[PDB]
Amino acid sequence: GPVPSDRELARSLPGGFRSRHARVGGVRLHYVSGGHGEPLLLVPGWPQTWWAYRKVMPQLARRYHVIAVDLRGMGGSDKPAGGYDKKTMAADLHALVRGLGHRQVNVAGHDIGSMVAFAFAANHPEATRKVALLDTPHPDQSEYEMRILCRPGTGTTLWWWAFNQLQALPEQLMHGRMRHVIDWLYANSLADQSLVGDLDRDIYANAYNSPQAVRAGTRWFQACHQDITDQAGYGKLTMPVLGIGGNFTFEDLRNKLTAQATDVHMVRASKSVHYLPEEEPDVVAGALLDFFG
Amino acid sequence: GPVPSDRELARSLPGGFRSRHARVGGVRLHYVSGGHGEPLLLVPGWPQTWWAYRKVMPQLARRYHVIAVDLRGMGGSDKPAGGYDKKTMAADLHALVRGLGHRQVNVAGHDIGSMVAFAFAANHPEATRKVALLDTPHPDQSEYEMRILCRPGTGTTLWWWAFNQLQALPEQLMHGRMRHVIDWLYANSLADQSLVGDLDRDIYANAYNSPQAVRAGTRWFQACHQDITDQAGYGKLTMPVLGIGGNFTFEDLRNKLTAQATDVHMVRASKSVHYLPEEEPDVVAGALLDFFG
Ligand SMILES: C[C@]12O[C@H]1[C@H](O)c1c(cc(O)c3c1C(=O)c1cccc(O)c1-3)C2=O
Ligand SMILES: C[C@]12O[C@H]1[C@H](O)c1c(cc(O)c3c1C(=O)c1cccc(O)c1-3)C2=O
Numbered sequence: 001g002p003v004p005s006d007r008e009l010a011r012s013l014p015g016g017f018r019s020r021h022a023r024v025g026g027v028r029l030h031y032v033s034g035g036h037g038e039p040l041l042l043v044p045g046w047p048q049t050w051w052a053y054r055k056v057m058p059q060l061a062r063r064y065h066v067i068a069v070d071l072r073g074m075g076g077s078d079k080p081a082g083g084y085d086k087k088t089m090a091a092d093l094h095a096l097v098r099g100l101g102h103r104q105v106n107v108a109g110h111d112i113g114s115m116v117a118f119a120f121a122a123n124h125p126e127a128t129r130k131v132a133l134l135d136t137p138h139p140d141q142s143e144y145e146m147r148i149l150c151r152p153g154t155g156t157t158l159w160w161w162a163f164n165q166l167q168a169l170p171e172q173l174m175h176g177r178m179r180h181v182i183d184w185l186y187a188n189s190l191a192d193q194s195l196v197g198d199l200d201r202d203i204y205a206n207a208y209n210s211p212q213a214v215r216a217g218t219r220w221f222q223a224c225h226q227d228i229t230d231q232a233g234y235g236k237l238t239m240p241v242l243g244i245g246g247n248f249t250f251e252d253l254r255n256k257l258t259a260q261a262t263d264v265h266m267v268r269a270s271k272s273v274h275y276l277p278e279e280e281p282d283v284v285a286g287a288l289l290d291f292f293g
Numbered sequence: 294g295p296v297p298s299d300r301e302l303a304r305s306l307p308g309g310f311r312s313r314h315a316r317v318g319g320v321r322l323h324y325v326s327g328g329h330g331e332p333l334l335l336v337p338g339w340p341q342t343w344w345a346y347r348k349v350m351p352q353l354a355r356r357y358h359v360i361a362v363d364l365r366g367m368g369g370s371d372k373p374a375g376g377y378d379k380k381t382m383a384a385d386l387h388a389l390v391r392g393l394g395h396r397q398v399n400v401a402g403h404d405i406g407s408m409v410a411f412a413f414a415a416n417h418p419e420a421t422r423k424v425a426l427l428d429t430p431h432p433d434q435s436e437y438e439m440r441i442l443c444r445p446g447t448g449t450t451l452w453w454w455a456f457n458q459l460q461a462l463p464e465q466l467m468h469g470r471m472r473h474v475i476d477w478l479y480a481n482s483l484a485d486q487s488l489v490g491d492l493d494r495d496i497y498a499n500a501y502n503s504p505q506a507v508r509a510g511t512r513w514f515q516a517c518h519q520d521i522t523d524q525a526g527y528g529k530l531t532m533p534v535l536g537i538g539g540n541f542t543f544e545d546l547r548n549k550l551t552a553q554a555t556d557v558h559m560v561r562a563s564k565s566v567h568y569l570p571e572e573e574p575d576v577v578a579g580a581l582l583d584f585f586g
């Protein structure tokens with residue numbers, strides 16, 4: 001393989017993490033687990049893998065039994081034809097942790113994984129001790145207000161939200177070329193490019209480089225219309241909620257969570273644009289430790 | 294594989310066309326000309342070349358001296374570092390036809406080329422006998438209202454408007470793979486895919502497949518902020534204006550032309566989505582012949 005296997009990556013971490021799989025509802029999920037204490041489910045997003053949490057997993061494992069998953073369609077997990085709505089991907093994770101003998105878990109999610117974390121809390125409150133959303137709120141009607149063009153100096157264009165709606169073309173252009181996508185994303189977020197090194201970037205590129213892998217990634221985005229419909233039906237979250245927001249999304253995240261939950265806490269990742277677990281790991285680990293207790 | 298040279302393509306058409314070049318302001322432009330009568334400048338768009346007008350050029354040449362150009366950055370023309378705002382590209386064409394000894398010309402443009410035709414009329418009214426805009430209005434403030442997401446019911450994702458704003462990534466993803474881009478575009482427009490054959494698609498792909506060619510194409514889109522600023526300064530067009538609009542863009546084109554011009558005629562290409570010269574050549578040729586007279 002071009003990059004180290006997940007088994008090797010897992011072993012390279014302090015804290016005795018191990019790479020595993022579990023089959024839930026016919027979908028085989030890959031995850032890495034380790035540490036001792038109450039269960040903590042960590043959910044990554046696009047275009048990343050469980051490896052995105054590499055910087056905070058050892059600190060977290062000191063207090064929690066960490067379970068860092070690859071979503072349906074992601075990394076070492078199966079890439080089925082459908083079920084890429086966040087409600088369904090949340091049910092995967094619910095089945096996973098219940099299968100591992102946990103009645104309720106702490107949950108933290110980032111990017112697409114944050115949407116799943118929120119859907120997890122909304123659909124399975126009894127299995128949700130507390131939930132943390134990193135940067136990304138669940139889709140709602142505001143998604144329909146995203147603009148194609150920004151006036152100069154007024155923000156970053158969310159081009160991938162449009163491009164990933166497409167059939168066929170995304171896998172045709174991006175297969176074998178995902179390192180370029182990853183580099184663009186990081187060029188437009190990281191304050192210092194060395195925050196994510198060459199090999200880690202290639203670990204992600206390897207995960208997404210097959211046509212099937214690119215395609216599965218796009219399904220997360222194409223499911224937005226369904227996600228928005230589902231969001232309208234959700235009741236208010238009553239368990240403790242944490243929002244950690246970067247400089248660009250903090251206010252929006254605060255507004256949406258406060259309207260969607262009764263018990264909200266906010267932490268500002270003041271030096272981050274989007275990739276919180278990689279941009280400010282100590283702030284993220286500390287916030288999660290403080291919040292989950 | 295390789296495609297015919299522009300000279301072979303030009304000679305392949307009925308009506309005695311010849312492939313030529315002219316250098317204006319240090320920029321060498323490629324164009325194909327033929328026919329007899331008052332001059333008619335034909336301007337294509339993205340990701341196409343002068344060859345987009347092949348279906349209408351013989352008919353038009355029976356009445357006009359046709360001049361079908363490759364824009365700055367397009368096909369056989371030079372690809373300089375800058376000058377891809379529509380005002381500058383129109384000045385290129387103005388210099389071209391003046392250099393060829395024409396005081397005034399008929400002008401028709403499609404897609405990006407329609408923007409250029411409009412700018413030609415706005416900046417060089419004395420050199421503009423009449424102007425025809427095919428499908429695409431000049432950028433204005435409404436460009437900033439384009440939405441990334443459409444509800445599952447309506448139209449096509451305007452993904453290319455967002456994607457082509459990017460630095461580096463477009464040439465990185467699209468080099469050598471433009472045939473897939475072209476196939477996607479046609480899959481989402483032509484009523485019958487045979488309207489644009491394999492060889493024609495490959496002629497376009499050949500023009501755009503190198504990184505520098507992809508890059509030049511994106512410059513037309515990146516210049517949008519400048520184009521919008523320029524549009525704000527334009528007075529109303531007073532020479533005769535024709536808008537030919539595809540079935541779904543007709544109302545928007547009519548509304549915009551009517552607000553920006555005093556003497557507007559409209560023709561509907563009721564069976565077309567966007568590529569008017571290829572989808573409904575008889576409508577396009579007939580409309581231009583009637584209008585230019
Ligand atoms: C669900 C997701 O659309 C995915 C994407 O991963 C995403 C999201 C938000 C961003 O603000 C954002 C990105 C993203 O790739 C990115 C790169 C650089 C700057 C920046 O601001 C971003 C998201 O929530
Ligand atoms: C300036 C330009 O943005 C360029 C693009 O070439 C463009 C434009 C309009 C379309 O409606 C349109 C396209 C385009 O590629 C396309 C493909 C399939 C359907 C469809 O409708 C379109 C434009 O005017």
Ligand code: NA
Nearest residue numbers: 168170171215
């Ligand atoms: Na695809």
